[PDB]
């Protein structure tokens, strides 16, 4: 399992230990700032906090900061490895808190494992945190410890999964009963494996208006019903049905309606599902192996409402569904705790979303969302731009309804505006591209097949099933390099090799190249020499003929050495007379794209307009709404240089061609990126918020800005340089492109070849 | 005290609460990265940690992370305000940990104030932190609590000041005994006010090889000596001298040699100092009021060795002296605790530094270091580029000598290299400029005297005593704007006003302007109209005549509208035929300067060489070693455009003019900023490390890059645009310049006017 075991063992800790880096969000680059932070000047915020404790969440963390406080006794799915020893998956849980909702997580881990001193230590560390994210407290001391801890602090004491997925689970129940046009009054339930996140879930499920006598709790030891054991089990006898001689699970169905269970191995069978009433609602939430094998049961019976917790299938129950967003409702409302109305109004938001999901800048191409409410869609997919702006305000609204909050939110229009603004700056458009490429792999030429980076990328693409690689190079050198690198790919089995020499199609290749380039300075002998010594020409001829769907070159040599071949063979797209390369950056303002960093040295107004339109179309296909800003050293007519006049001409041309495109210019970079500066300068600007597409006057400015920002102000690699305006799918990369860049660009080329590769 | 009370009450929390922002130091902008951080992929680091606890500091925080763990019982100098209520000055102490040494600080605050349960909670939270920074534990439970806590954890349990300043204090003692050519064997001591950081200091002071009988401990209740109280005070009777009838402090001197004391109000007098032996060594460390009033005692007796803890005078004892750097020695060595050899070898480093301080890129101009070892120099100044690379390796070396560490450092050449690399990226060149301007204020014209920003900057400059402002505007409008803004400045009292109309020197001003511009298109009537409607012309004529020393314009209008006036009046500098504007950025690689962002639209090779030389000279004057890199879209001859050829010509010209300047090009921005890319491309490059001066081919590229980086990748404002090549000190700013920018630029102009303002 080294393709996952070793790959995950290769953990991103190498630059600086720990995914979290406690760092100043404020400037600390001047003695004034340092004195404001540790010298007289920092005594004032502390004194103001001491005067009235109302200022605790304001001047410090503890506003956005949760602490996933743990004794390391059930580390996600690991168990009792320890507080300090739990740090890997501790940080793994804490990193999908900031990543998806911007939750600060102090990964402080309580070393006290006793079920009564652990609470003492946690309550001791209460003032550090504005809401604890109690996780890895194991069963049965999870319920005991959480019950003890809820009653002490005056700040949101919200456990993990124990409170947890009940919101997602009960939302899924509310939607599933909607699917089969049933009612909560008469629904019957079957629960198996009363574990940490299982036995506490029906308690919420009851809160919807559910009678206790309809729930049948079970564990490893048969069925937990009143009459089975002389000593009635706590928190389970309320639901416990009268004794009726039902000792086996295969008969206790009697036409039930729900299978809410968060446990381990399988307990349900196909005949068990058959004994269920009409329209079964199996909800097997087991992560290792689904308790019903959904394909088998669906072949046994149709119209299934099977719900799981794995992302391979729709209706996935992750923590990111509401946990970061619960605290985005819990901490951002000022609550002193989380009630059951908190836990139930957020049920009415994510359940509402599944049958009220639409628009939200669907990826015009790529992605392949194809999400409609029904038997295969009960709750939204794990990651959603409004999984926040619907669930977090639900929790806050429940906070004010419960009257337990200390900082009630004002008019929700402003709250929704800020939440959506935060939404724009965090997008993961590459995951839909990977998903869409995986369901229809195409043949991609990699002309630099002997490169170590290209070989690693080939291994990754074979593993993820994104493409059918076609390497170009000497098979001997490729094989020895593969063996030395340690890869598990083989010729023919995983990737096709095209030998640059002794190619059986040599005659038909150089002939086509000559017929393309006979009147462009290439003789027949030069064509023959190019189809043996220029792998880019071989790949381009392969793609043009039809033996491959896309090409990914550029990892060797200069950009234009490959782009000239690409343009000569494929040509320009229909209705397009220019090409441009778009580079993506993850700035603090969000995903930003810089247009024509590589192709045109000094584009003119018409070329700039074409590049702007192509960049907007490409960014639209990513699922991001294009917000273009033409950049210059002049701010809205400040200078009369030919460059600024060219930018204004391009703006007019773009407005002519695409009246619906949000674009403005020419302006400065800060005016484009921050809205306050632009509003001060141009209050009537057609550009709203931060611009995500930056069109530059010349290639020098674009390249210098991108190179400086990538090493200074950038998080990770997504795509770039995305070549636009060529007839066939091909992306010329750079010699310093990483393996991740190559894999992402190959996936993008595969998805573009799924859309008429011409 | 509102100029400090309100100003410090205006705390930098407005954008995001809390100086610390627990944020991913790793990219989290892709589903791959999110799964690596919270999904299967983060289970691997945690499992590897659990397998062997040796991986705790490696995959997470707890390597660089201290937690200043507190019950909020003595918050720096505040007291027992509370754990959560101590958050302001808690974060103030935690912010001068990351700011000066890059120490992560989890500001977790223990709510348990009992002297025996506090330790229980702290030991419970031990696995979260790789070394605790116990602070705000009050006396006498500070000593008790620290003594209890030292013996439990197997990770560095290093208290604050209690262990603390002993390193700096005993280093100061070691240097002071060097100053007066005495020996530790026969030195006598007087201690007053045995407080939290006082009674624990002589314990280290003994460890140098000091006899216990030479120390005389005292408190508020007279003198703590053996025979005074029937019950002998603990930790003080070892030093306690035999009873001799000495009941008053004014006589217990008998020619002593040290006054080590960390207490409150004054106890020592002038006749007390006279009773001291030859060459007194008073070391009054009281922060509110010095215990001796050093000027008065120095007038009473010469050759004083007075040492205080305030930064207004040399030999300041701050936490930044060694505390962040102790943990930079403690945590970065893998120790399980801090011994007394840790606490004593770091005494031999900072004490060594004071008499071994030299070079280290002294600010060629500005700054005014003027630091020589002697009676007024015992220990280095609070902030020093090698206060780290000498003290932290001292603590690590003491760790290996004590044999208590778990990750001993390899060959110290690599350690010193990394430490110096970290040193380059954190510089505070503006503090020396502020210090040098304050000791010689000059007259600075502010032609836009009616601007709210300029008025705020004028208030700041009057308060700090950096300049003698000369505002230009209507006195009526200026006064009403001052009253509305709430400032406490008055005309004549604090700043001079020059009325643009009805100026008594109108005739002599427009006459000089006409004589300058008579053959440049300006008539006598146009000169008269300019000296009434153009404040920049008035300020420039003022500076040229000699009635003012510097000008700071540009807060209104276009840059070149002011630069044309500046160039026409003052002209170019001697031997200089071009001007350029340098803008400063605080990048992750350090302070970076971009050359000619405002003046020359398309400079040629000679202009580029002149701009490069002027920028290097200016950066040298800041105290930073210039590392220039000429930027282009071509990487070392990749492209043959006229721009890249011009950059290469400029490189050759610069190498001719300044053979000692470290410069290379032309290259890409990433090649300039990160050394790995450059070494891959040009292994023999003359540029080492990251380039701090970036010279751009044209003004469009420079301006776009600076504008994008300032809003994306930048911490704070220092200076910019710094105008170079004009005869007299003047800086044209931008209309969006903040008050801090104006104050910094005025201070820079003041310091430049101290250096022959012509
Ligand atoms: N959101 C998610 O996707 C998510 C979140 C959390 C957990 N989970 C899944 O839930 C399970 C454990 O999570 P947890 O920590 O909440 O619970 P847990 O504390 O691990 O307990 C699991 C329970 O399952 C029962 N069990 C074990 N083997 C069984 C068998 N052969 N037949 C019947 N019952 C059996 C045990 O009950 P007895 O003590 O009576 O044996 C045990 O208490 C794992 O499968 C995990 O992947 C999924
Ligand atoms: N690095 C620095 O610059 C630095 C660091 C820490 C502290 N300090 C200074 O040290 C002082 C307190 O710091 P701390 O927390 O370490 O100590 P602390 O716990 O505040 O105790 C101060 C001690 O001074 C004594 N005292 C008070 N008034 C006195 C008087 N009139 N005459 C004689 N003794 C008197 C008291 O002793 P009794 O209990 O016997 O009255 C008290 O225990 C402040 O002045 C503070 O600024 C400076
Ligand atoms: Mg967990
Ligand atoms: Mg303190």
Tokens representing B705 are 């890059």
CA distance linking residue B122 with residue B109, whole number of Å: 10
User: Are residues A91 and B60, on separate chains, in Cβ contact within 8 Å?
Assistant: yes
CA distance B464 to B438: 7
In B, which residues are within 8 Å of A705 by CB distance?
669, 701, 704-705, 708-709
For A525, left (φ over 0), alpha (ψ -120 to 50), or beta? alpha
Residue in the structure block whose two tokens are 């392969």: A542
Q: Cβ distance B349 to B321 under 8 Å?
A: no
Q: Determine which residue's CA is closest to atom 11 belonging to ligand 1.
A: A263
Q: What length does chain A have? A: 758
Which residue out of B79, B195, B309 has the highest number of ligand 2 atoms within 8 Å of its CB and is therefore the one to mutate? B195
Q: Enter the resolution in angstroms.
A: 2.7
List CB contacts (< 8 A) between B645 and chain A: none
> Is A288 in the B-facing interface, judged by CB distances under 8 Å?
no
Q: φ, ψ for residue B455 (rounded to 5)? A: -70, -40
A506 close to A477: Cβ distance less than 8 angstroms: no
- Only one residue has tokens 């009616």, namely B450
**Cα angle at A135 between A133 and A136, to 5 degrees?**
165
Q: How far apart are CA A583 and CA A572, in angstroms?
A: 20
Structure tokens at A451: 């490169």
Q: Which pair of structure tokens corresponds to residue B132?
A: 């605790």
Q: Is A194 annotated as ligand-binding?
A: yes
Q: Are B464 and B444 in contact (CB under 8 A)?
A: no
What is the helix (H) or strand (E) element at residue B629, kind and residue range? Answer: strand B627-631
DSSP string, B329-395: HHGGGTBSS--TTHHHHTHHHHHHHHTT---SS--SSSS-----SBTTBSS--S--TTTTTTHHHHH
Q: State whether residue B406 is helix, strand or coil.
A: coil
Ligand 2 atom 38: the closest Cα is on which residue? Answer: B220
**Is ligand 1 within 6 A of the CB of residue A291?**
no
Q: Are strands A693-695 and A662-667 parallel, antiparallel or unpaired?
A: unpaired
User: Which residue do the tokens 């030991």 mark?
Assistant: B123
C-alpha of residue B205 to centroid of ligand 4, in Å = 21
B38 is catalytic: yes
CA of A288, nearest ligand number? 1
Residue A411, exposed/middle/buried by CB under 10 A (0-12, 13-18, 19+)? exposed
Report the greatest alpha carbon distance in chain A: 96
- A195 ligand 1 Cβ < 6 A: yes
Q: Technique behind this structure?
A: cryo-EM
DSSP B117-174: HHHHHHHHTGGG-SSB---SPPTTHHHHHHHHHHTT-SS-B--STTTTTHHHHHHHHH
How does B730-742 read in b/e, with b if 16+ C-beta sit within 10 Å?
bbbbbbbbebbbb
Flag if A707 and B669 touch (Cβ within 8 Å). Answer: yes
User: Is residue B309 within 6 Å of ligand 2 at its C-beta?
Assistant: yes
Q: What is the DSSP string of B419-442?
A: HHHHHHT---THHHHHHHHHTS-E
| A325 lies within 8 A of chain B by CB | no
Q: Measure the CA–CA gap between B745 and A690, rounded to whole angstroms.
A: 29
> Contact, B282 vs B268, CB < 8 A?
yes
Contact (Cβ atoms closer than 8 angstroms) between residue A324 and residue A97: yes
Give the closest residue (by CA) to ligand 1 atom 1. A318
User: What one-character DSSP code corresponds to residue B55?
Assistant: G
Tokens of B704: 């776009």
Residue B13 contacts A, CB cutoff 8 Å = yes
- Check if B696 contacts A (Cβ < 8 Å): yes
Helix axes B391-402, B323-330, angle to 10 degrees: 40
Cα separation, B720 vs B699, in Å, equals: 15
- Angle, helices A535-545 vs A524-533, to 10°: value is 100
CA distance A749 to B603: 41
C-alpha torsion angle, residues A508, A510, A511, A514 (rounded to 10): 160
Assign A580 to helix, strand or coil: strand
Longest Cα–Cα distance in chain B: 96
Separation of alpha carbons B433 and B747, rounded Å:
7
Shortest distance, CA A736 to any CA of chain B (angstroms): 8
Please state whether beta strands B590-595 and B580-587 pair in parallel, antiparallel, or not at all (unpaired).
antiparallel
A151 by DSSP, 3-state: which?
A: coil
H-type alpha helices, A311-390? 323-330, 342-345, 347-354
Calpha distance A47→A26 (Å, rounded): 20
Tell me which residue has tokens 């660009």. A745
Distances (CA, A) of B602 to A257, A603, A649, B642, B651: 76, 18, 22, 11, 16
Q: Is B207 exposed, middle or buried (0-12, 13-18, 19+ CB in 10 A)?
A: middle
Pocket lining: B161 vs ligand 2, CB cutoff 6 Å = yes
- Active-site residue (options: B5, B19, B26, B38): B38
Taking contacts as CB-CB distances below 8 angstroms, the residues of chain A near B697 are 700
Interface of B with A in 637-676 (CB under 8 A): 638, 641, 643, 668-671, 673-674
Work out the minimum CA distance from A622 to partner chain B, whole angstroms. 13
Q: How far apart are CA B24 and CA A20, in angstroms?
A: 5
Phi, psi of A74 (to 5 degrees): -145, 90
Nearest C-alpha in B relative to A14: B59
Whether B538 and B472 have beta carbons less than 8 Å apart is answered as yes
> What whole-number distance in Å separates Cα of residue B742 and Cα of residue A174?
60
User: How far apart are the C-alpha atoms of A597 and A699, rounded to whole Å?
Assistant: 5
Report the alpha-carbon distance of residue A172 to residue A201 in Å, rounded. Answer: 12
B144 annotated active-site: no
Ligand lying closest to the C-alpha of residue B136: 4
Rounded distance, CA B162 to CA A751, Å?
64
How far does the CA of residue B81 sit from the closest CA of chain A (Å)?
Answer: 6
Provide the strand spans (E) within B478-600: 496-498, 550-553, 580-587, 590-595
Q: Which residues contact B189 (CB under 8 A, 6 or more apart)?
A: B202, B205, B214, B215, B216, B256, B257, B258, B259, B260
Catalytic residues of A: 38, 93
Whether the CB-CB separation of A277 and A301 falls below 8 Å is answered with no
A747 lies within 8 A of chain B by CB = no
Residue B520 DSSP symbol: G
Please indicate if any CB of chain B lies within 8 Å of the CB of A316.
no
Contacts of B614 (CB under 8 A, 6+ apart): B576, B580, B724, B725
Point out the residue among A40, A59, A699 whose CB comes nearest to the CB of B87. Answer: A59
Of B36, B91, B706, the CB nearest to A12: B36
B291 lines ligand 2 (CB under 6 A): no
SS3 A664: strand
Q: How many CB atoms lie within 10 A of CB A10?
A: 12
| Secondary structure of A455-476 as H, E, C letters | HHHHHHHHHHCCEEEEEECCHH
d(CA A13, CA A32): 33
Q: How far apart are CA B623 and CA A490, in angstroms?
A: 58
Q: Could you say which ligand is closest to the alpha carbon of residue B169?
A: 2
For chain A, the distance separating the N- and C-terminal CA atoms, rounded to the nearest angstrom, is 39
Is residue A200 a known part of a binding site? no
The pairing of beta strand A65-66 with beta strand B627-631: unpaired
**Least CB-CB distance to B78: which of A9, A43, A95?**
A43
Contact A336, A112 (CB under 8 A): no
CA distance B553 to A253: 84
CA dist B467 and B462 (Å) reads: 7
Residue nearest to atom 14 of ligand 2 (CA): B196
Residue B670 phi/psi, 5-degree rounding, is -70, -40
| A195 annotated ligand binder | yes
Kindly give the pairing relationship between strand B20-24 and strand A20-24: antiparallel
Q: Which two tokens stand for residue B169?
A: 């204090």
């Amino acid at each position: 399992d080294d393709q996952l075991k070793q790959s995950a063992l290769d953990f991103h800790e190498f630059p600086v230990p720990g995914k979290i880096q406690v760092s100043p969000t404020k400037p600390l680059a001047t003695q004034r700032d340092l004195a404001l932070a540790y010298s007289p000047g920092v005594a004032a915020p502390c004194l103001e906090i001491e005067k009235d404790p109302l200022k605790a969440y304001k001047y410090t963390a503890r506003g956005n900061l949760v602490a996933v406080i743990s004794n390391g006794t059930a580390v996600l799915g690991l168990g009792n490895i320890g507080a300090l020893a739990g740090k890997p998956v501790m940080e793994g849980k804490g990193v999908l808190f900031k990543k998806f909702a911007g939750i600060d997580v102090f990964d402080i881990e309580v070393d006290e494992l006793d079920p009564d001193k652990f609470i003492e230590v946690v309550a001791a560390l209460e003032p550090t945190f504005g809401g604890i994210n109690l996780e890895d407290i194991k069963a049965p001391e999870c319920f005991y410890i959480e019950q003890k801890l809820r009653e002490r602090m005056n700040i949101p004491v919200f456990h993990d999964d124990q409170h947890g997925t009940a919101i997602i689970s009960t939302a899924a129940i509310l939607n599933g009963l909607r699917v089969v046009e049933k009612n909560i009054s008469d629904v019957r339930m079957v629960v198996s494996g009363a574990g940490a996140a299982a036995i506490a879930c029906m308690n919420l499920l009851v809160a919807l208006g559910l009678q206790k006598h309809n729930i049948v709790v079970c564990d490893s030891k048969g069925v937990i019903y009143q009459g089975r054991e002389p000593n009635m089990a706590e928190t389970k006898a309320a639901y416990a049905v009268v004794d009726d001689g039902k000792r086996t699970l295969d008969d206790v169905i009697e036409g039930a309606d729900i299978f809410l269970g968060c446990s381990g191995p399988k307990v349900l069978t196909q005949e068990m599902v058959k004994k269920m009433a009409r329209a079964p609602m199996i909800l097997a939430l087991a992560n290792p192996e689904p308790e019903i094998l959904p394909p088998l049961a669906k072949e046994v019976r149709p119209d299934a409402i099977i719900c799981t917790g794995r992302s391979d299938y729709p209706n996935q129950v992750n923590n990111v569904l509401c946990f970061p967003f619960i605290f985005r409702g819990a901490l951002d409302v000022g609550a002193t705790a989380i009630n059951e109305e908190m836990k139930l109004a957020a049920v009415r938001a994510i359940a509402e979303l599944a049958h009220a999901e639409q628009s939200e800048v669907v990826a015009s191409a790529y992605g392949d969302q194809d999400l409609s409410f029904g038997p295969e869609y009960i709750i939204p997919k794990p990651f959603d731009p409004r999984l926040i702006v619907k669930i977090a305000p639900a929790v806050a609204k429940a906070a004010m309804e419960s009257g337990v909050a200390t900082r009630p939110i004002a008019d929700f229009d402003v709250y929704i505006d800020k939440l959506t603004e935060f939404v724009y700056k965090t997008n993961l458009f590459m995951k839909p591209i990977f998903s869409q490429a995986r369901k229809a792999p195409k043949r991609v030429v990699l002309p630099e097949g002997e490169e170590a980076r290209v070989l690693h990328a080939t291994q990754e693409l074979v593993t993820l099933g994104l493409a059918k690689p076609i390497l170009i190079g000497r098979p001997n050198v490729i094989e020895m390099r593969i063996q030395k690198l340690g890869l598990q790919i083989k010729a023919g089995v995983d990737f096709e090799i095209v030998n640059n020499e002794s190619d059986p199609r040599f005659k038909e290749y150089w002939t086509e190249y000559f017929q393309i380039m006979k009147r462009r300075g290439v003789t027949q002998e030069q064509a023959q020499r190019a189809l043996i010594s220029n792998p880019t020409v071989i790949g381009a001829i392969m793609v043009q003929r039809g033996e491959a769907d896309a090409m990914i070159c550029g990892t060797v040599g200069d950009y234009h050495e490959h782009f000239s071949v690409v343009k000569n063979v494929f040509g320009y797209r229909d209705g397009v007379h220019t090409a441009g390369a778009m580079n993506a950056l993850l700035l603090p303002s969000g995903n930003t794209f810089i247009a024509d960093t590589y192709v045109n040295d000094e584009p003119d107004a018409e070329e700039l307009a074409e590049i702007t339109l192509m960049a907007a179309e490409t960014v639209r296909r990513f699922g991001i709404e294009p917000r273009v800003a033409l950049l210059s050293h002049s701010n809205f007519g400040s200078s009369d240089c030919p460059s600024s006049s060219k930018m204004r001409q391009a703006l007019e041309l773009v407005r002519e061609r695409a009246p619906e495109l949000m674009i403005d210019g020419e302006m400065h970079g800060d005016a484009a990126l921050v809205e306050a500066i632009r509003n001060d300068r141009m209050p009537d600007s057609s550009l709203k918020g931060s611009a995500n597409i930056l069109v530059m006057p010349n290639m020098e400015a674009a390249r210098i800005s991108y190179n400086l920002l990538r090493v200074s102000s950038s998080e990770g690699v997504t795509v770039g340089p995305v070549l636009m305006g060529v007839a066939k799918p091909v992306h010329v990369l750079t010699p310093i492109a990483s393996v991740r860049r190559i894999v992402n660009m190959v996936a993008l080329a595969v998805v573009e070849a799924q859309t008429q590769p011409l």
